[PDB]
């Protein structure tokens, strides 16, 4: 091979995924955190491990970069610590959130070429990459991560900004809600350490009920839905209706005091904002992505809820890839490996010729 490996970096609100184009999975995943004492800067797992003696910062808390000084440190960490490569020696494909401000796109571009001296780079919308990973160029993606969720209609490879909806309800909120209801049950999960334990309980024992009320009735009259969970100190606790009550908040945000529409309604509203001529393509190609869409039963629940909102004559299909937790990264690996994509990279030459604003033309 003549070309060096290209890098794929998925910038997540909670976890960053990094690896090499062509691979089937990211080589590294770490917390999008930077910490400094209350070694001068700590990034990733280490910052989390030593959080006790540090003040943590979340530079991309809700999907959008808010502090470029710390984001630069996360990227430095990604190259030198996680992937152990020199960025000046490899093209880099970066991901961005839907509705990312134009100025931010230019900033990312300038930093890659001027700070890291990348030989080439490109930036793609997360939702679009997930759709690519599913083998489609048209459809609507419901991306629910750690700090944010989005419904992104995509037609012929292009996201439709006017129809994109943002929901400030995701994995983080669900974890805290589970801590709250488990505490109401009689336990006590309130500390940061306990938040990590509940996050684990959430990822392992929660599920989306097909019918909330029926599930609540079953849990109230029997122990058939109860599951045991063992804490590190040996204590075994019981999780009952909390298993499905937690993710139910995605469909009924009021449980969290939020007036926002649930994910099914948000998906429907995005589709309705699109040209009537492509709505059927979206209904027939609703793809789920992100860690928060991993709950067992979520696909069937979405199918049921969307069917209730859409015309009776509409064909509804929910696609839930088993590997959807990393579909963004995988889509990037696929894209960066495409023969026709090689001409699309922004080269250092092109950057020197046109400057940061070239990103709008090259990465439309
Ligand atoms: N199996 C699972 N069930 C439910 N939630 C999960 C599961 N696996 C991961 N999560 C949650 O998904 C979120 C992270 O997903 P991710 O798409 O990586 O987000 P981001 O890109 O914003 O960091 C976290 O809140 C995590 O707890
Ligand atoms: Ca993400
Ligand atoms: Ca409501």
Swiss-Prot record:
List the Pfam families: Actin (PF00022)
Q: Write down the superkingdom of origin.
A: Eukaryota
What PROSITE patterns does its record include? ACTINS_1, ACTINS_2, ACTINS_ACT_LIKE
Positions where N-acetylaspartate occurs in the chain: 1
Reactions catalysed: ATP + H2O = ADP + phosphate + H(+)
The EC number(s) attached to this protein equal 3.6.4.-
- Subunit composition? Interacts with Rab6.
Report the locations given in the UniProt record.
Cytoplasm, Cytoskeleton
Q: Which Gene Ontology cellular component terms are annotated? A: actin cytoskeleton; brahma complex; cytoplasm; Ino80 complex
Q: Which residues carry this modification: Tele-methylhistidine?
A: 62
State the name under which the record lists this protein. Actin-5C
Family the entry assigns = Belongs to the actin family.
| Primary subcellular site in the record, as a coarse category | cytoplasm
The miscellaneous annotation reads: In Drosophila there are 6 closely related actin genes.
Record keywords: Acetylation, ATP-binding, Cytoplasm, Cytoskeleton, Hydrolase, Methylation, Nucleotide-binding, Oxidation
Q: Which InterPro entries match?
A: Actin, Actin/actin-like_CS, Actin_CS, ATPase_NBD
The first-level EC class reads hydrolase
Provide the GO MF annotations for this entry: ATP binding; hydrolase activity
The UniProt PTM text for this protein says: N-terminal cleavage of acetylated cysteine of immature actin by ACTMAP. Methionine sulfoxide is produced stereospecifically, but it is not known whether the (S)-S-oxide or the (R)-S-oxide is produced.
Kindly give the SMART domains that the UniProt entry links to this protein: ACTIN
**One of this protein's GO BP terms?**
maintenance of protein location in cell
Could you tell me what this protein does?
Actins are highly conserved proteins that are involved in various types of cell motility and are ubiquitously expressed in all eukaryotic cells.
């Amino acid at each position: 091979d003549e070309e060096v490996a290209a890098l794929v970096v998925d910038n997540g609100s909670g976890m960053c995924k990094a690896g090499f184009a062509g691979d089937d999975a990211p080589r590294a995943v770490f917390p999008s955190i930077v910490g400094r004492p209350r070694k001068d800067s700590y990034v990733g797992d280490e910052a989390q491990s030593k959080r006790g003696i540090l003040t943590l910062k979340y530079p991309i808390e809700h999907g959008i970069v808010t502090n470029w000084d710390d984001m630069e440190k996360i990227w430095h960490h990604t190259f030198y610590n996680e992937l152990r490569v020199a960025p000046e020696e490899h093209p880099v494909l970066l991901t961005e959130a839907p509705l990312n401000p134009k100025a931010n796109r230019e900033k990312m571009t300038q930093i890659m070429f001027e700070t890291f001296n990348t030989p080439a780079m490109y930036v793609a919308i997360q939702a679009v990459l997930s759709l690519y990973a599913s083998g489609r160029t048209t459809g609507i993606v419901l991306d629910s991560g750690d700090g944010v969720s989005h419904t992104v209609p995509i037609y012929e490879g292009y996201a439709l900004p006017h129809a994109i909806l943002r929901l400030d309800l995701a994995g983080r909120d669900l974890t805290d809600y589970l801590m709250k209801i488990l505490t109401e049950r009689g336990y006590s999960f309130t500390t940061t350490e306990e938040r990590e334990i509940v996050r684990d309980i959430k990822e392992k024992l929660c599920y989306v009920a097909l019918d909330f009320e029926q599930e609540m009735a079953t849990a109230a009259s029997s122990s058939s839905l109860e599951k045991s969970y063992e804490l590190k100190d040996g204590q075994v606790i019981t999780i009952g209706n909390e298993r499905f009550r937690c993710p139910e908040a995605l469909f009924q945000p009021s449980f969290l005091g939020m007036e926002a529409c649930g994910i099914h309604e948000t998906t429907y509203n995005s589709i309705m904002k699109c040209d009537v001529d492509i709505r059927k393509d979206l209904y027939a190609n609703t793809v789920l992505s992100g860690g928060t869409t991993m709950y067992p039963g979520i696909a069937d629940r979405m199918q049921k809820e969307i069917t209730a909102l859409a015309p009776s004559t509409m064909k509804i299909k929910i696609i839930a890839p088993p590997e959807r937790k990393y579909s963004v990264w995988i889509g990037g690996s696929i894209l960066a490996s495409l023969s026709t994509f090689q001409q699309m990279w922004i080269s250092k030459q092109e950057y020197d010729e046109s400057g940061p604003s070239i990103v709008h033309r090259k990465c439309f």
